[PDB]
Amino acid sequence: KVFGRCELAAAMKRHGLDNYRGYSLGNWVCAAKFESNFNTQATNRNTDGSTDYGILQINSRWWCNDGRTPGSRNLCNIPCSALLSSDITASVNCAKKIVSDGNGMNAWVAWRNRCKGTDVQAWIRGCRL
């Protein structure tokens, strides 16, 4: 599924990401934009042989099982394909765990290089929320 900007904002808010560990909703929308372009089906291979899945590009090195990332973990206890669903529940629940794990949103390199320190509020401008 490719979400609309404000559609994603709303789904993300419904699922409790607005100010989750203090990250305002704009931060999440900004991260999703630059990670997947709001496409739930996005997949990208990492240099280490792991792969990133779904709207927030969650990694098989630590967070999910894709059956081909040796010496990895599955800390969200899910198959990585659940992260590609049109329903973002598993992505968001896994994201909550990632963002809680010590490094906050810095765990997302796109957030850190393209959202952190910026006017992220712009990402949720015009949206009925």
What is the domain-level CATH number for residue 44?
1.10.530.10
Which tokens go with 22? 């203090």
> Whose CA is closest to 32, among 115, 104, 117, 125?
115
| Cα separation, 91 vs 68, whole angstroms | 20
Sort 73 into a burial class: Cβ within 10 Å, 0-12 / 13-18 / 19+.
middle
φ, ψ at 16 (rounded to 5°): 85, 15
| Cα separation, 111 vs 35, whole angstroms | 8
Which one of the listed residues 18, 35, 48, 87 is annotated catalytic?
A: 35
**How many folded domains does the chain comprise?**
1
Strand partners, 53: 43, 58
φ, ψ at 25 (rounded to 5°): -55, -35
Which one of the listed residues 52, 66, 87, 119 is annotated catalytic?
A: 52
**Residue 66 labelled as part of a binding site:** no
Q: Where are the alpha helices (DSSP H) in the chain?
A: 5-14, 25-36, 89-99, 109-114
| Cα separation, 82 vs 70, whole angstroms | 19
The answer to whether the CB of 93 falls within 8 A of the CB of 63 is no
The residue segments making up the domain with residue 58 are 1-129
Instruction: Please give the method by which this entry was determined.
Output: X-ray
35 assigned to active site: yes
Strand partners, 39: 2
